């Protein structure tokens, strides 16, 4: 039982490591070919099925999760001179969506355990220009929506949920996406309910918001089955149309969602139960009165547990990454820096001439504090992506737990590697 | 034959009317299935195949033709405080692409025969803010690229070709898209080389421009090395779907076979209609070929003794009589782009941006662009049906319908003159 990093046998054999995601069945292939030969509407069918399944008043299918967010901002009257508060830790799309609607993104620090935007820090970053908050259900964990909605009601702000990483997740038993003014979902191939490529869904209880998004996704036009296209546009629109084939594929995926979801919940629970026993390993958790979608598993590692009183947390992160990967556990980072460090948000050039920042006069150094929690989380955390999403990954996650337990049984070697 | 409108048999029987487009063959189905099962990559493959067929230095596959246009503007440094000259007759995406990049679209009138940006009207509308021109190869007719490129080079402007309606068309033997600084194509299901849904291609000879669009389509990231999520500037999700890319690769393999049939079929169709007095068939301008994406016909009221009457009256009469024969005659654009609410209201993203950067204003509804209005007033279009390589016999039935209607000028005049 020598470490694989030093010639030992890997806890995960090479021929056991591959996982297919999306999980393509013959029903998926048939759905795509049927959509191709049907020559049409799978998009409105997906809209109805998603709204029905998750109890939303309205669902508008769009090209991408990013387009869902930007069309949501447009529909809620967010634009030039407006600030949108988003988390300092997220996928870059959350920070770009405001820029796409010519609004200025304002970065709030996150919670050290939930990894979601800290409502206390949101309050500290509100100005007279604040128009909206994009809470992200990051990694599949629902954000503090009671606090976010309370802040929004106080200051008259719009709330758009970025639920891209949290399909099926609940907050006080409510489907995520239906709590804010609108909710954004991504059907990107890597996501928990994927399409065969790109896709987005905007959900809302507000008929007028839905209609705005419906027009915005198709050049501002009104498009109806049986009615000849007149090319009359009623406002600023884009090409944010979903592909029918991708819609048909996701409809097929939805018929297995409940079974896939049960397997993930059971498999992830068993995996984290074993890792939670390892000292200096913090398994990801759902906050109280929420359920986690487990899109990404982020683990925080404490140098204290390996007697590394002096060692930078990044050194332990590096050491654990090398050792776990050698055993065949594909441990990754998800985001190397807080979004505020990204060149686009530092240079503040945007479209050109500093727009949208030029409108608010936020062209010079960023207002408010640094984001030490976002930085601390990145400094000491590794992630598992994709492999745990597959319903038959039970045995694979058992071997992952073997690898973790094996690495933790060599604490002297971890401390040595962290030393260099 | 007696007119269908007055109880005769239609020139086009209903069982001949339906045309499948895109034309889906087993090779398309296998390409799509292989793309699902595939899990080097179909997007990269299409980029190479498209660049190779049309002789472009660089091809960047993107979500849509609209995204190809807006990313091209971004790459050429067009943005806030800039103006972009576009034609007053086009698909709205041509006018929207500048707004999408926070620039102001400036509409120039079109030529009464070519329906393309009139270089005589471009020169008038250049200001200190003009940064670019987007000539459209509208309906498949290459624009006057001699005069548009000359104007641009004389004034230090960028040229982006909107070639969405003209794949395979040439200007002085040069593939359209490759003449400007950059060229945009649409692979939308209705286009001459379609995908099974949405798709776009940006082509250019400039490596730096291609790299800008490559980053712009994927959140500003460099993708090949594990994904590090490092963004180098303002980006979007303008990624093409691999499945749509694979489908278009299959279509592109058959493109010139379809071109050969399509070009023969349309030429024979237009030769028959060209004989009918007061009917102007569409034409390729000198030193160009036509892709025939859309066939736009202009009708002269003088030919029907309606010299006094609104051309729209004749347009409506001909549309009614030809549709009764089974010819799906349509309009393509009911108004010049500058009459569209987005360009009239100048609200844009909100607070009048992008117009607010400069305090730039535009024309009110109905104010300008008389030729675009004149063309809309007296023209009907054929869309889709003539694109299919097997539509030879169908277009001959359409020609039978036109000849029937033109053999009854008194009945055309009566309908045109009626309340
Ligand atoms: C994937 C994702 C998005 C954007 O989705 P796309 O469909 O890729 O545009 C936005 N936010 C988060 C948190 C995501 O994970
Ligand atoms: C179709 C088209 C576009 C835009 O293409 P999409 O792929 O639909 O975004 C732009 N210009 C012209 C002339 C077009 O015909």
Automatic annotation (TrEMBL), chain A:
Pfam families hit by this protein: DegT_DnrJ_EryC1
Protein's UniProt keywords contain Transferase: yes
Keyword annotations: Aminotransferase, Pyridoxal phosphate, Transferase
Cofactor: pyridoxal 5'-phosphate
Gene Ontology BP term (one): polysaccharide biosynthetic process
Protein family membership: Belongs to the DegT/DnrJ/EryC1 family. L-glutamine:2-deoxy-scyllo-inosose/scyllo-inosose aminotransferase subfamily.
Organism: Streptomyces ficellus
Chain positions found as N6-(pyridoxal phosphate)lysine (covalent): 191
Protein name: DegT/DnrJ/EryC1/StrS family aminotransferase
MF-aspect GO terms: pyridoxal phosphate binding; transaminase activity
Binding site for pyridoxal 5'-phosphate: 65-66, 165, 186, 239
